[PDB]
Design an enzyme around this catalytic site. Sequence first.
Site, short mmCIF file in Angstrom:
data_model
loop_
_atom_site.label_atom_id
_atom_site.label_comp_id
_atom_site.label_asym_id
_atom_site.label_seq_id
_atom_site.Cartn_x
_atom_site.Cartn_y
_atom_site.Cartn_z
N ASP A 196 33.15 -21.56 14.00
CA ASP A 196 32.03 -21.24 13.14
C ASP A 196 31.92 -19.72 12.96
O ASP A 196 31.58 -19.02 13.90
CB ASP A 196 30.73 -21.81 13.73
CG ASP A 196 29.54 -21.71 12.78
OD1 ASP A 196 29.56 -20.86 11.85
OD2 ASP A 196 28.58 -22.48 12.95
N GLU B 77 26.78 -19.14 8.97
CA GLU B 77 26.26 -19.79 7.77
C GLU B 77 27.12 -20.97 7.30
O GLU B 77 27.29 -21.19 6.11
CB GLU B 77 26.11 -18.75 6.65
CG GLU B 77 24.94 -17.80 6.91
CD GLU B 77 25.04 -16.47 6.15
OE1 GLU B 77 26.06 -16.21 5.45
OE2 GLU B 77 24.09 -15.67 6.27
N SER C 276 42.44 5.16 -2.21
CA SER C 276 41.73 5.97 -3.18
C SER C 276 42.69 6.56 -4.21
O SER C 276 42.26 7.21 -5.18
CB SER C 276 40.94 7.08 -2.49
OG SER C 276 41.78 8.12 -2.06
N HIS D 279 54.50 11.68 -4.28
CA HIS D 279 55.46 11.25 -5.29
C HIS D 279 56.24 12.40 -5.93
O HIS D 279 55.92 13.58 -5.76
CB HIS D 279 54.76 10.45 -6.40
CG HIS D 279 53.80 11.25 -7.22
ND1 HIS D 279 54.20 12.08 -8.25
CD2 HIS D 279 52.45 11.34 -7.17
CE1 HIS D 279 53.14 12.65 -8.79
NE2 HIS D 279 52.06 12.21 -8.16
N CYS E 15 47.30 13.75 -5.67
CA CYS E 15 48.54 13.37 -4.99
C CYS E 15 49.25 14.55 -4.33
O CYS E 15 48.90 15.70 -4.54
CB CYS E 15 49.48 12.68 -5.98
SG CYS E 15 48.86 11.06 -6.52
#
Length: 350
Positions: A175, A178, A274, A279, A297
């Site tokens: 459980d 709810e 985010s 790169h 970046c």
Amino acid sequence: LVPKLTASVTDGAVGVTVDAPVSVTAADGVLAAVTMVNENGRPVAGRLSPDGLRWSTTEQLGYNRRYTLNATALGLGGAATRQLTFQTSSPAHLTMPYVMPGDGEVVGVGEPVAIRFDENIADRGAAEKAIKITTNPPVEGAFYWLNNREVRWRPEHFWKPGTAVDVAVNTYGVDLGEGMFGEDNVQTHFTIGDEVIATADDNTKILTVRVNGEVVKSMPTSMGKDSTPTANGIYIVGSRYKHIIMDSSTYGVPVNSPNGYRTDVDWATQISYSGVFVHSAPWSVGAQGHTNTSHGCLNVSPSNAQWFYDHVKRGDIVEVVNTVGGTLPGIDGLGDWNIPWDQWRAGNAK
């Protein structure tokens, strides 16, 4: 003395959880036969022990079922027979867990254990309790929730390499609150690889990669311009792409706005949800090592970006220092280590 029959359930019981097998035991006798069927009459598979004293279900029991147990015991003192009927949990909702990192994988020293649930968990404590982490060599860790669906687990400090980690997500029958119950169990096992830590210093504008303490690469980098700076802090290496279209709207900035962008880039390694990547940026090689020019970046030369792709794996660490940005949110998805251990350890199950 007549044989005595004891079960791990009782006649008339309701809300029997199915996270455990059901068992019958004989005293002052042996078990002659034991059967358990559901309402439809479908048998549940069981097993009697060689000495005849113990019987246990060997199959998973279903939600929302009525089961009937029939057992016979014989002894010198005569015979005995019980019939038990019990009803199992009837969930209002089912939630399925997904566990990361992937099974068998070898990952970096900053990789947290992650359990993501497809539904909101009302009783975080119950979820934490059903998750059993095993570590070799042993090390202490703790649970913290990044949102209502995903709980993370990690040591106080980066893993020591060579560490085995076993993750047993045993939510079936549990459980979670709810009236939500686990749809299933999941189990992953992974190993911690080489320590790989790459530091990006804004004062020097170099990204320095260190493998087991040795410097092995030094990359001039161009980070985020002052209006859109790169956050300081610890970033955990995530997924890796040979090429990818970066879409600012995927991180909640409309492409069509001033800080929006849509860029097709090569050799990208995601270090935050985010939208921070290491790169390849040929368009700024003249700025790399000198001036920050990106939307956030870590811009590097093509050959350095590809080097990163090839030598950095999921779970390795990137640390940003001395930018004009703030700190990377701990609940980012890849910014877990930016949360103070005392705060992490205290958890947030409530």
